[PDB]
Amino acid sequence: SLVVQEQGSFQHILRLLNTNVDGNIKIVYALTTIKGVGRRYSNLVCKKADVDLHKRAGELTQEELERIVQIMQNPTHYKIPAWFLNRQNDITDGKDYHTLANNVESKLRDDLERLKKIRAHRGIRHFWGLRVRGQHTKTTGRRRA
Amino acid sequence: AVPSVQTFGKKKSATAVAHVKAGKGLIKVNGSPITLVEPEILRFKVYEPLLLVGLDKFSNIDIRVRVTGGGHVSQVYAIRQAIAKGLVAYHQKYVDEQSKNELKKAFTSYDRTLLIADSRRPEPKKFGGKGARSRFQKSYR
Amino acid sequence: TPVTLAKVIKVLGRTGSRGGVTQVRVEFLEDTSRTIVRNVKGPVRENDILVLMESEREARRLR
Amino acid sequence: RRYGKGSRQCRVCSSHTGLIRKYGLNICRQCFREKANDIGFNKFR
Amino acid sequence: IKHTLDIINVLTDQNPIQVVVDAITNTGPREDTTRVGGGGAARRQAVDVSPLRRVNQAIALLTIGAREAAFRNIKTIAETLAEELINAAKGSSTSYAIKKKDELERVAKSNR
Amino acid sequence: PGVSVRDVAAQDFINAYASFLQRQGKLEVPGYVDIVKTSSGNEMPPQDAEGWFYKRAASVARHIYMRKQVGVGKLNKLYGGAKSRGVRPYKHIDASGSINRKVLQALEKIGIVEISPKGGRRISENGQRDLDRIAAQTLEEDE
Amino acid sequence: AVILDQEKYDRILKEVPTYRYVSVSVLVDRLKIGGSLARIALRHLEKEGIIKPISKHSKQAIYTRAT
Amino acid sequence: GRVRTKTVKRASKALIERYYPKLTLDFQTNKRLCDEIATIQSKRLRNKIAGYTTHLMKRIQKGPVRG
Amino acid sequence: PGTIVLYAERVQDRGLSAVAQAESMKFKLLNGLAIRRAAYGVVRYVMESGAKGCEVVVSGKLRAARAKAMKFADGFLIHS
Amino acid sequence: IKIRITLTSTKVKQLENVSSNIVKNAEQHNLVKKGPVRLPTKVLKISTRKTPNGEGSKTWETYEMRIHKRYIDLEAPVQIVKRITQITIEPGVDVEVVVA
RNA sequence: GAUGAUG
RNA sequence: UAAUUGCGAUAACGAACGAGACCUUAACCUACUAAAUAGUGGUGCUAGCAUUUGCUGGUUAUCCACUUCUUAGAGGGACUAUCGGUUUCAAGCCGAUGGAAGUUUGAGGCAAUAACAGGUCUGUGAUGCCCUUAGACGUUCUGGGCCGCACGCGCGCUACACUGACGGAGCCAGCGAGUCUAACCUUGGCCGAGAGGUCUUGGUAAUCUUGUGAAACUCCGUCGUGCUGGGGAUAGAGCAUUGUAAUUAUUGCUCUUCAACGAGGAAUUCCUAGUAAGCGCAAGUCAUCAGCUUGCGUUGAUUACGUCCCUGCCCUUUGUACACACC
Known part of the structure; x- marks a missing residue:
């Protein structure tokens, strides 16, 4: 139990993967602003990257930040178990990937496009904008737009 | 054989079997010292029988209790009642009457539950509701 | 303003449309031998001491 | 037949329900x- | 209650229980009102308030005021009740309990 | 007088023993401690990523002491928790079998526990010596 | 505020001792510092003897000025 | 309520006109006589019948009672 | 075979079993006897036997399209 | 010869006549036994709606059937067990005997 | 001793 | 009076059903008859810590004795007994001591006469009549649907956070259920992050699963008034179980996505103590799936002990052009 001073080099915001990340927020939960990084992906990334979780987001040095970005962009390279990733056995390549930043939304628009051209039931349902997962639409989800 | 006595107490489904015998002041609940009873906040309930009479009366006796059933709160009420009853049953058999009467007077004047169990028992649920006397909401339109 | 205290010496039966009031006879602690009839809001027995904000009012009744 | 509602019937009136x-x-x-x-x-009771 | 009492004796150097009894005795509204009417039109009437009920309603105002303060507020529950009790026994208008005692009495006087 | 494990609060004993095992460093750590979460019911991994494992070992060592025999099943029940399930209400969900198994395997190697007939583990002679020595240490530090 | 600089640090050491009652919340509104930092400050000042605890409880900390 | 029914009032009435000398002013004794004097089908009814009889002996002590 | 044996035994007090008399009505009414004659026949036989009360109710399309219930009774019966 | 005599039924009075007959029959022969160990009663339940068609206020009904198992241990020669198994036939009571 | 039509 | 329950009055006298009685269940018994398929103590063997004769434990093939706790069978007990008030002073009402228990001791089951054109011919090999009776409305087989969504409603479950969320420790119930024309409840060891897989084992049951080591709860920490580490709806990606077969995802696991919701308008529902309310477990349904229902326990308040204002019920008196009966 101790308290120490800090020099004014603290930077309040910082751009990772082209998405500003708050500085006044602990690093574990501050990196969640980057789309594709959830609470448990950050919890693992910081520890695989040897970062003092107890320090706030803006208390990380530049060399630390670049470490997090690299580890996070090719997670398997640093022994991040395959099942953590958000995409596995890609339908078009066979490789495992974790999607970050803008690639999240872009890939989603890809999948819906793939189904639509395939003309499979899921694709038709999205085109019409209705619930896809089989939910009853008689009494729910009316004023959605 | 060593002088001894047995008693018990209850509240809801809790039952505490207290075994007493002449000794050197040992007092133990479930094989641990009385001091380690939990939940912490209600510990002075377990102490209550010892204080209301005086720790002197317990110097020549050993009490071992074992409690089962109920929940974390009703048990503490079982324990204190087993200690109160055990002491008065020991004075019933191995000490004069005048002492037994005085000891019962100290407990009764303070909290009747230390000697006599609580009569309250639960009521069955009835169909047409979530509980004993509550009912489902009713609708007309 | 001051306050005055009186003591209930009888209960004269419930009043109010819905039964929420009680009719009582009081007895002033000081200058006793003066008794007024007035109304109460909650449970009340004999020997209860009331704090009347004003003294010279006397209470209506259903009869 | 090995399971389900239709695998069974009341032993008196052969009703499924x-x-x-x-x-x-x-x-x-x-x-x-x-x-x-x-x-x-x-x-x- | 354990935390709140400890706090009170820190903040005042008076017996914490005494604060509770003083605050209650300063909060029970002496004069109240009831609805009286016939056929549907309704007007209030002035009535007195019994001893038992002054305590019952006193505690209600105290815990209700403390609880509303603790909501969406950094101060923990134990404190808001501690400051509510300190003020009320002080007869201070800052207390939520005393504010409401005066409001009820004022309406009771206008309807005599 | 003497001392038994039952003479010291559970919280005091568990903290003292977890520190001791951490210091001696003769207990095996399964390696994936930094990844897994101790029960499916949880939604985040344990906070004390350094010493949560030595903490679990401290509890289970005592738990055998109090009882006769236990198993992976008894420990899944013991450390189970309430799932959230979002919109739908809660329900008891058992803990993680892998952790509670590899703690039991680890304990025998350091010599605190042995298998027993009837199934399940059992406090060994050595384990009692280990747990009671420390017990007297915790009480002695009441200052 | 989260990161405390000498301006915000010496302020604590000079104003805490006069308080009648100090706790996690009191240090968050008298001088602007988050609740988290309020806790480490409490567990530091105590170590140096500037405040005396009345009772220590996980979700409620109660201290006072030292004597 | 504690209002007895006619099956109790009449049964006690029959006992007094046939067994006044043997009844006493004591419940327990009257409880045992009603077992030797009348055939009753329950412990509950037997207690009630004897209880009223005791009550009637008290009345007759102070003065005769109509009926 | 040979393990289960069937025996017959004439009843005791034929006039005091509800199943027996209920059948007696069914066969009389199938025969063609009027409703009232039959219902009071069972009541009379039950009572003379020693029964302390008998009741018979015959409900249906007794005389016209609308249905109704008839009651016949003798003695006294309890209900609770 | 060691025997266990488990008895069961749905009506105690009959179960008591047969069981009490067992202890008196054995005690006049001055055998050694463990008195009738009365096991807890087990109560069955079937809760169902009263209505047969699904209309009206929601009302439920509960039923019950009870079982009164006992067992008695004896130590007697063979010549006497032969008739012990043949005595005490009473409708509504089921009896089973296990040797050794 | 407010108001209160209709099938 | 809870009561057409009684006191009485009296052109009525004596009777019958209903209520009460009755039965079930819950609370007491150091009193009777027993009980390793329940428990307790003593002694054998025995681990650990101190050591003066101690504290806590293990041992089902080691034995002995016993019945406070546990099961029952048969009984006892409460009747408002006793006492003080109050009424023609009768039925009773108010209070008090004692007692396990003094609102009919609490909770139920049963439950009258007369009706409804209430619900069911989709429970019935219960039926009248009418229809149909072989390119069938019969029986069965494959594939869909009862889930389709511009909207309106009635039962509900998550929440809107510090009386908190999250992570480690603490650690406690009762009601139940479980394998024939057969695979059921499942311990234990091993494998996997999880789900789950695999080899054995106990139980046709006070013996095993099962102390059902359940949840809320407590203790210590991370968070710090910020749509925020509250909330997890809506979507993507993989991994598994049950089933011939899951796509219109049955369900379960894992990472990603992270919307409405800042305490809710007129209106309106339930409740008088172990009750409301909070928290979950067994059962019914079941191959699979609870946000349902029937029970069970665990933690446990505030506010009346009244009234006829609103909504309705019972009895008498009185008016009526109502009888389909104030619609």
Whole structure:
């Protein structure tokens, strides 16, 4: 139990993967602003990257930040178990990937496009904008737009 | 054989079997010292029988209790009642009457539950509701 | 303003449309031998001491 | 046939619906009430 | 209650229980009102308030005021009740309990 | 007088023993401690990523002491928790079998526990010596 | 505020001792510092003897000025 | 309520006109006589019948009672 | 075979079993006897036997399209 | 010869006549036994709606059937067990005997 | 001793 | 009076059903008859810590004795007994001591006469009549649907956070259920992050699963008034179980996505103590799936002990052009 001073080099915001990340927020939960990084992906990334979780987001040095970005962009390279990733056995390549930043939304628009051209039931349902997962639409989800 | 006595107490489904015998002041609940009873906040309930009479009366006796059933709160009420009853049953058999009467007077004047169990028992649920006397909401339109 | 205290010496039966009031006879602690009839809001027995904000009012009744 | 609603039938009226299977009675609810006295199920509380 | 009492004796150097009894005795509204009417039109009437009810309603105002303060507020529950009790026994208008005692009495006087 | 494990609060004993095992460093750590979460019911991994494992070992060592025999099943029940399930209400969900198994395997190697007939583990002679020595240490530090 | 600089640090050491009652919340509104930092400050000042605890409880900390 | 029914009032009435000498002013004794004097089908009813009889002996002590 | 044996035994007090008399009505009414004659026949036989009360109710299309219930009774019966 | 005599039924009075007959029959022969161990009663239940068609206020009904198992241990020669198994036939009671 | 039509 | 329950009055006298009685269940018994398929103590063997004769434990093939706790069978007990008030002073009402228990001791089951054109011919090999009776409305087989969504409603479950969320420790119930024309409840060891897989084992049951080591709860920490580490709806990606077969995802696991919701308008529902309310477990349904229902326990308040204002019920008196009966 101790308290120490800090020099004014603290930077309040910082751009990772082209998405500003708050500085006044602990690093574990501050990196969640980057789309594709959830609470448990950050919890693992910081520890695989040897970062003092107890320090706030803006208390990380530049060399630390670049470490997090690299580890996070090719997670398997640093022994991040395959099942953590958000995409596995890609339908078009066979490789495992974790999607970050803008690639999240872009890939989603890809999948819906793939189904639509395939003309499979899921694709038709999205085109019409209705619930896809089989939910009853008689009494729910009316004023959605 | 060593002088001894047995008693018990209850509240809801809790039952505490207290075994007493002449000794050197040992007092133990479930094989641990009385001091380690939990939940912490209600510990002075377990102490209550010892204080209301005086720790002197317990110097020549050993009490071992074992409690089962109920929940974390009703048990503490079982324990204190087993200690109160055990002491008065020991004075019933191995000490004069005048002492037994005085000891019962100290407990009764303070909290009747230390000697006599609580009569309250639960009521069955009835169909047409979530509980004993509550009912489902009713609708007309 | 001051306050005055009186003591209930009888209960004269419930009043109010819905039964929420009680009719009582009081007895002033000081200058006793003066008794007024007035109304109460909650449970009340004999020997209860009331704090009347004003003294010279006397209470209506259903009869 | 190895399972499901249709694998079973009331042992009295061959009805598929309402069947009570506890204790292996295999009788429908309407038929249980009529026969309870003879089966040994009495009404106490 | 354990935390709140400890706090009170820190903040005042008076017996914490005494604060509770003083605050209650300063909060029970002496004069109240009831609805009286016939056929549907309704007007209030002035009535007195019994001893038992002054305590019952006193505690209600105290815990209700403390609880509303603790909501969406950094101060923990134990404190808001501690400051509510300190003020009320002080007869201070800052207390939520005393504010409401005066409001009820004022309406009771206008309807005599 | 003497001392038994039952003479010291559970919280005091568990903290003292977890520190001791951490210091001696003769207990095996399964390696994936930094990844897994101790029960499916949880939604985040344990906070004390350094010493949560030595903490679990401290509890289970005592738990055998109090009882006769236990198993992976008893420990899944013991450390189970309430799932959230979002919109739908809660329900008891058992803990993680892998952790509670590899703690039991680890304990025998350091010599605190042995298998027993009837199934399940059992406090060994050595384990009692280990747990009671420390017990007297915790009480002695009441200052 | 989260990161405390000498301006915000010496302020604590000079104003805490006069308080009648100090706790997690009191240090968050008298001088602007988050609740988290309020806790480490409490567990530091105590170590140096500037405040005396009345009772220590996980979700409620109660201290006072030292004597 | 504690209002007895006619099956109790009449049964006690029959006992007094046939067994006044043997009844006493004591419940327990009257409880045992009603077992030797009348055939009753329950412990509950037997208690009630004897209880009223005791009550009637008290009345007759102070003065005769109509009926 | 040979383990289960069936025996017959004439009843005791034929006039005091509800199943027996209920059948007696069914066969009389199938025969063609009027409703009232039959219902009071069972009541009379039950009572003379020694029964302390008998009740018979015959409900249906007794005389016209609309249905109704008839009651016949003798003595006294309890209900609770 | 060691025997266990488990008895069961749905009506106690009969179960008591047969069981009490067992202890008196054995005690006049001055055998050694463990008195009738009365096991807890087990109560069955069937809760069902009263209505046969699904209309009207929601009302439920509960039924019950009870079982009164006992067992008695004896130590007696063979010549006497032969008739012990043949005595005490009473409707509504089921009896089973296990040797050794 | 407010108001209160209709099938 | 809870009561057409009684006191009485009296052109009525004596009777019958209903209520009460009755039965079930819950609370007491150091009193009777027993009980390793329940428990307790003593002694054998025995681990650990101190050591003066101690504290806590293990041992089902080691034995002995016993019945406070546990099961029952048969009984006892409460009747408002006793006492003080109050009424023609009768039925009773108010209070008090004692007692396990003094609102009919609490909770139920049963439950009258007369009706409804209430619900069911989709429970019935219960039926009248009418229809149909072989390119069938019969029986069965494959594939869909009862889930389709511009909207309106009635039962509900998550929440809107510090009386908190999250992570480690603490650690306690009762009601139940479980394998024939057969695979059921499942311990234990091993494998996997999880789900789950695999080899054995106990139980046709006070013996095993099962102390059902359940949840809320407590203790210590991370968070710090910020749509925020509250909330997890809506979507993507993989991994598994049950089933011939899951796509219109049955369900379960894992990472990603992270919307409405800042305490809710007129209106309106339930409740008088172990009750409301909070928290979950067994059963019914079941191959699979609870946000349902029937029960069970665990933690446990505030506010009346009244009234006829609103909504309705019962009895008498009185008016009526109502009888389909104030619609």
